[model samples]
Target chain A: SGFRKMAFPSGKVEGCMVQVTCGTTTLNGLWLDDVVYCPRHVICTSEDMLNPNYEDLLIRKSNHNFLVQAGNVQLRVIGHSMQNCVLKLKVDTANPKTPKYKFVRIQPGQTFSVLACYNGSPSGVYQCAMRPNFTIKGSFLNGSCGSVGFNIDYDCVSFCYMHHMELPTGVHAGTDLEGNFYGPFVDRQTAQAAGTDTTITVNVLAWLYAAVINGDRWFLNRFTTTLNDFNLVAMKYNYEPLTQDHVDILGPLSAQTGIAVLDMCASLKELLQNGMNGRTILGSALLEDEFTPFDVVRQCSGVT
Target chain B: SGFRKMAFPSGKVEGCMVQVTCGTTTLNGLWLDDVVYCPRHVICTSEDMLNPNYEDLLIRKSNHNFLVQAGNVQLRVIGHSMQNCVLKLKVDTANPKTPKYKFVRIQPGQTFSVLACYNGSPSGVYQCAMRPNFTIKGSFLNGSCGSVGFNIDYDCVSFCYMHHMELPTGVHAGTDLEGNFYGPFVDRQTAQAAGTDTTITVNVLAWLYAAVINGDRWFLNRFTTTLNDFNLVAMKYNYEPLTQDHVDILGPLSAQTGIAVLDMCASLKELLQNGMNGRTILGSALLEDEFTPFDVVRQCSGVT
Candidate 1:
């Protein structure tokens, strides 16, 4: 891996779930070629973390350059104290060697800093710098971070939506790859079609991974039609734009998290970097797992 | 659940997975009121079992009433024998139950009996009479059955797709329970509406569960619109007809496994009864998990 954490068995079989491992935590995922991807935040931890007071963050103990946003101040995990909890207070009143490098005890009940680094992965599917653990009282806990969708239930996904793999420096979300997330591609003719372009393939691959970690298999079965329908939705996000109030009113998940959401991968990555949100917040609990506004199907969830 | 295995904590929260257990085995599932339902076969086991010669069957050491189809003759596990292998050769003038109950070793490399019978449950989600394990060599082994979906991966679904429960009679498939699988119901006003009628409710719930076990979240996010579109499809299934050849051709799954397929609750049950088909064969491997003729999106899968 150019930076860190690449899963093993680098490739996946046809009609089979892509598999990968980070530490002892072997995670299953959808394929994007040698890159095996999955969600960073999983269903178990995220559910209780929607609005937390504490800030949960994963920092590589070494490799000094890893930086993250702790609210207003951006800081690196290394160079800072390797304490269990991290506090984002004080970039003020400096110290020389110790550098007064403040840290936040990254745990639950606090807003978790989604230290998602594999931003270079496909649009929907993602990987990480290392195998981050959900630190509670702060031990180098090695238990699973929990899974996204039915992937784990079927032994075909990662227990931790936390996926890893060796990848190149330039292959960020939009890079063109011959692989696709939405396919085994029943045939070769279908492989080179324009529909399976770079963006859509990455988007689809990531979407497929998202659907898995989130347990939204609807895409796996309804892929083509939904992709077409997804086009209309993606167009709205890319070109049409949601009004601020609409954005506010629409405000996340249920149907709010749909094929349409694929357009926001770039926006989400930026948000993930700027602060703790996007998958960190919305990804909490499960995918609907909602109808906030994404699809009218939110009704299927309840009486609204 | 009366004569078989019943998972613990039978009830489920509005949004939380209904957790259950048998012996040391713990499982989580969706709720149909008190029922925690899941698939009988998992993705791992079913993958290589589409057309096997050896009969794979999970028989409980204690239960005496369990009966399954071993080709032409139907046999029970109790009086017959508990050997790792089971053969269904002759009802002959037989050993009077060998009382000559010839078992075909009931392992892989052969046709596995679809020993599923939580028929008392909903149309889709089913629980086993017991936690049946996979038999490689004829040992009463205890290990997870892999999973049907991403559920186990996320600590949300059953690793075995093997669900459990304590249910009642007259509650099979179309039972008019107020519980709707398609809901947490956002509000009560919408709960009582006709749209969530017993059949549809059971079907939707079953469909919802099936989508989960199979990893089809398109139904989760696109639920309502798709359900509306699903209405058209279901209607085609309910009123319109597929030619027998169409039935033979349309055969199973892909779009073939849509909301429209909901109409066949009774049909599938009958089919499951008639022999080892339906979920037993199609349920094999992952859900597509396919597409012969259902949604045009089958293209998303490949050139075919």
Candidate 2:
């Protein structure tokens, strides 16, 4: 399904999504609509992931129980296909002698729940990979006996194979998560395609002032993990990392411009030093009361 | 036990009762009372814990379950006999090889928790240590038998010696999670007493934290992890490390000064930056509110 776009004031991206399609099936009905928002401005809602771009995250080990939590964590994970999203909690990273990971099966959009906890840490790097069919097809290359064996070996492995492909250091792949461009890679006649492949794209939401990622509460800090993960995947895929250049051409023409770009403290300092006025590229339009400026210095400086 | 002033307000050198010779069978409701406070107009919080005294903290791996609900999450822990308690939820830091710590447990107090989670990155360094005790004294020293085996090898062949002391550098000894300093050895006692002693400590707490030993959550932010694990642990160790510091001091001072120190952020920052002002110290001996400006500033400034 082609995605929709909305622009309220500044022509930028805020919030707009396309339908999740699996083969001939549409998952719109199954999508969880209950979006939970914390005191922070970030919004987290669930969606029925229709063959969402799958990538191999950290390597995995065995035994050590891995714990995962999110305040407004979102997943559009494929069900039946990806029975569980696994995370390997490593005891050590370089020489993963003992591997441990907590494997979790996530239903559409729910608050964080316990996945799996083991006694020992993982033997290798913790990897987050998806299996088309949880029973056997999880490893992308092999349908059954995965290279990083699940049944045979104790270590966690990824179905997706990643190698350090030769590319300019600065000019590299677009993502560290999902590949830049993913596809149906299935029988054209079958319904296993995710609309004609569109690489994962990111749009800024909003910016805040003196916005302290409240550490008093675990979840109330800067929303960077999700953003960085998305960006890493984008970089791995050979796409241009989101920079002022990319936004310049996209910002002025969009209405939700102020919402999509986020820069905080160090990142914000870098942006300003390297020349950014703190504008956003939004994905949608919203009400007037739902807006604020990212102006801590302005406020402290007593300037309007 | 009375508290002695330390470099940082939260970093107090609590005095033991000077080896008190209390009768084995003492009265049931023994009463002891005292009050402590950082003089007004001091910065007790530091982005870096300079000359900070070390405190012990531990996370019982047995208490929590690893779960993922898209992103929603929860974590529970069992800890007491500890102060400046800090926790991390999903990320696994026990990389035994490189020893890259996944989660850090700090003495939970206000000076540590509030100042650390600034902008969502852990900015200070802390020292984390664990306690090991054995039922059979020779077990820990001889590396043969003891309760230390519970965390290492469950079966018995060798007399369970203390696991190759994973304690970080520069911390006090024999304290359980309640930040108790005992035996004056974080592991030294077992090593020296090997082959001769049988009354070794056993089945105790394991502590962990940053290296610099300041109670700040921002220092935790420096704890970069795989995006997924970072998300999980960050969510789990929800409270700021700073909060732990304030609770310990305020409870006593509020009773003596007859004024609540609830608005600790300001006083905390002040006390941390400068010790109790000279005037406040001199005046504190007299009236609660009356302080000669010179004496107050000098007493508070004595900190550096």
Candidate 3:
């Protein structure tokens, strides 16, 4: 964790948290903070690993659940249903279809914070999800809580592996062959050594987070899906198409990193064209580890 | 006289007017109307009359200097100048010091007018003016032609007189036989009679205008200057301390309508110690013919 800054794990008895029971009453340390939620406390469940809840419900089921954290983002209530208990948060970037949410209106020892930073990238890949967030009217056995999938990391980092480089199954690789930068390895020879000598000096923050997630998935996969299917989830990762050799190797790593170069794929194509109520800058300064691609062409020329 | 409202004869163009001479320019067209000055044109002089030309002045002063008829009153000068010619018309009722002035500025075919009116209680005396105005700049001909004194009558109407009255040495006199209205007249029978029963119901206009030339006791009794300056040019034509048995029967019509009653008694005590200039109810509208009780209680309590 050279890029330091972390925090994630909130309430319900701290890190690696759980309890928010209901059938047995554990709403982890009952009310007070943002108050509101009494229906006699705990009775919420969609069952995520026995209680962290997450279901399909839409109206009544809130029990003032938990999830707090402050340094690297945390918030949570997504599908951890209590019926429509919307409250969000949960970031960590390298673009996971733009996640930098904070939907607020929280309770349960309420606390929040998001100042993010992370690294390890190079045409690499890795995913993590907890998605689903929609029950928003004063939770705590009042409504919605059905979705809870924890752990986040949109890791991507490689050193160069063009030979039939198909990489997809949880991709992760930064360097080792001497190109220095390592760990978050998982594949590519666990980031080199036995194969050694592979194109050195070029992890460049996963080549500017894979050329701004390939022009942010070619500008968010041109809005398709209709005939009432509503469509849109398409983006697990993409990159390639921007060049003048990626703007001449991203102008001196975007003048030594203020991280620009289609800056986090134009901030995830501006959070997929202002979705999730826009305002999403995916903190930790776009996972900078001395971010470059000439700091993504000086944050696409606006001084980041 | 077509437009009817007449009263034109402003400042110094005396008894029949005519002299702005280049060559004997007799400017007084000899009078049939507003009689103030007309003798063939340029004769009697303190002499500033050069070739400025004048010809018996008045083809009524030319329909009293243009617009002749409507109860009498006119003055001319909106844009006429010679050098420092001063022309003034500052009238406000509720006396703001002696401002019943009509300082004339003549030339560019000079003219003048005023004929005010109105009614309601005791102390009612008014006379407004408005005529042809010209000779604006050098009025007395010095730079700001100041020290200008024209005719002081926003002059509308009223024509009666009564007992111990004697009235017109030059027609003054509005009251007595105790109706109270008094001078502003000099000869209309020293303000009295025609046999012992003239118009019978008279004593109409003259609640003020106590005349001018009396300190001419042969020119102030030659400065012996006191029997109290010959008893105040004797009361400047006195009216019996305003009568009691005609202060024992009218002494000279009490000295030529007590001199026009201190001629504008120094202008009502200069309007009862400064009143009417509340701008004399703002010009143009008076002809309130026989309005008395001393001009409606000095213009309804704002001193006359």
Candidate 4:
């Protein structure tokens, strides 16, 4: 049930000798990544089985994706130095059904990444292909003519980037009882089911809330959009350190009054997008009237 | 669910000018014994009940019993000097069917005793009745009064004690496995039905064999009559430590071996008692001798 690769220590000479210790205490010869050796002389081995050590490698309890890099190999190159070598990579993604991407490339001086890849269910492997770009080291990095030992190295920068949304203000400390110009959007169940759009918004809201607590200006910088969307003045100044009285008053208000405020915002957004935007039949040109609140120039000014 | 008792702190008060605080919280009156303080007030007013603040009383989680000495009260002393005090004590025996008892005439400068008791539960109240043989001061020392305190202090000593038997011929640590005369006792159910007079030899032997593996010499000690049982001998020699060897041997010997040993001892004891003076039969004597064989004994003795 277990398989392993062998590596010899430094100053060792028998590179071609490989030995495998089988489960029943039998030793045999085996091949690894096109490197073959005999059973009599292999020094050590690695198992490619589902071992318990992988649990911690994944960071969480599941969804581990790990690899063993080939440390050294022989290669033939022409007309370029190793420094000029760069590899562009692609993978036959393990999970074709998933929307998110999980792949990277290897180049000079780059370190391999240890990733916790989640694609609904825990996955085993993805077939990756690498080829050198037509740069200075094209023939050398490609290893098409001869084999070269290369380390695995790649990273997807956007994989862990924080590209998310902001919620209404003062809705966080969970204490408001009545006054509400801001708060989280309502119905968590529906929001969670709304795909990345809603999830990213919630994630951003939580991240900013944490940032605000740490006195980071990032949350405030991101909140300008939230303020602009609601045509709301920043009420961050009105926030106070919570006391028992604040808990007694604002706890109920966050639940009760916040719901009403969210309802109003949703209603207003619907009206502007559906009623005002679609009702261009009333007038498009400058025929200003006291009742025409939906006039673009006037409404854009009203939002400020 | 709560019980009430009124105590007269000074049962005999000479003056109406006494200032006293009534009961500690739940208690209604200034409690002393079983009488209430009916105030013929100089001033009758309600006050919070205060408990006695003897700081030394905080010594142990279950403090030792204490006695208070006072004579002038409606709860008056009926006898001589120092003969009027009563000692109040609490005990818990983990049973509900038993009644508790205490000391009478517990007066100034005296120590109470344990004496003996039976059939009483623990942690309940019992009254001390006055006895005539001793006075208040001397009654505790002389052990002459009726006491609610525990009279018996029997420790449930474990049965693992080892004692020497007769002479060179008597059972000793050098005996073989078969020579051991302890038991795989007839179980509790079997013993109960057999009653006090039934032959217990086979039962005792069963217990002895069981002790060799799953148990210790505690129960085996009961099988020895003024001598060391064979199991006790093995334990002394460190042979009692459980081993696969013993487990293997015990499986086959458990049923027949114990009964055979009992049958032999029973027949021999009966024969010896029939002709001797001041002789007695062993509990094992009730087992039938026909079931035991001399050849079996020889085999057990390691004759093979």
lDDT of 4 by residue, A43-122 (tens): 11233221223223223311111111111321111111011111111122221222222222332111111110111110
Q: Rate the local accuracy (lDDT) of all candidates.
A: 0.22, 0.19, 0.22, 0.19
lDDT of 4: 0.19
Span of ten consecutive residues with least summed lDDT in model 3 chain A: A115-124
Give the per-prediction TM-score of chain B: 0.16, 0.18, 0.18, 0.14
The digit string of per-residue lDDT tens for model 4 on B1-304 reads 0000100111011111111111211111111232122111101112211222222222321212121112122222221111111111222212121222221322111111111111110111111111111111110111111212211112111111011111121111101111121122110111211112122222223334332322132222222121134334334432222333333333444454442333322332333334222221221112111111221222232121
For residues A1-304, what per-residue lDDT tens digits would candidate 1 score against the true structure? Answer: 0000111111111122322222323333323222223322211133333432222323422323322322133332323221111111122223121211111222111111011111121111111111111211110011211111111111132222221111121111110011111111111111122221111222223323334333333323322333344445446433222233333333343144553433443333332234321122212211211112322222122111
Which candidate, 3 or 4, has the higher lDDT? 3
Q: What is the interface RMSD of each candidate, in Å?
A: 22.4, 29.6, 49.4, 47.6
List the DockQ of the predictions in order: 0.01, 0.02, 0.00, 0.00
Q: What is the per-residue lDDT of model 2 for residues A154-189, given as tens digits with 9 covering 90 to 100?
A: 122111211111121111110111121112232111
Model 2 root-mean-square deviation: 26.7
TM-score of each: 0.19, 0.18, 0.16, 0.11
For candidate 3, give the lDDT of residue A268: 41
Chain A TM-scores for all candidates read: 0.16, 0.17, 0.23, 0.15
Docking class of 3: incorrect
Pairwise DockQ winner, candidates 1 and 2: 2
State which candidate, 2 or 4, has the greater TM-score.
Answer: 2
Off by over 4 Å in 1: A1-200, A203-304, B1-304
Cα DockQ of the candidate 2 complex: 0.02
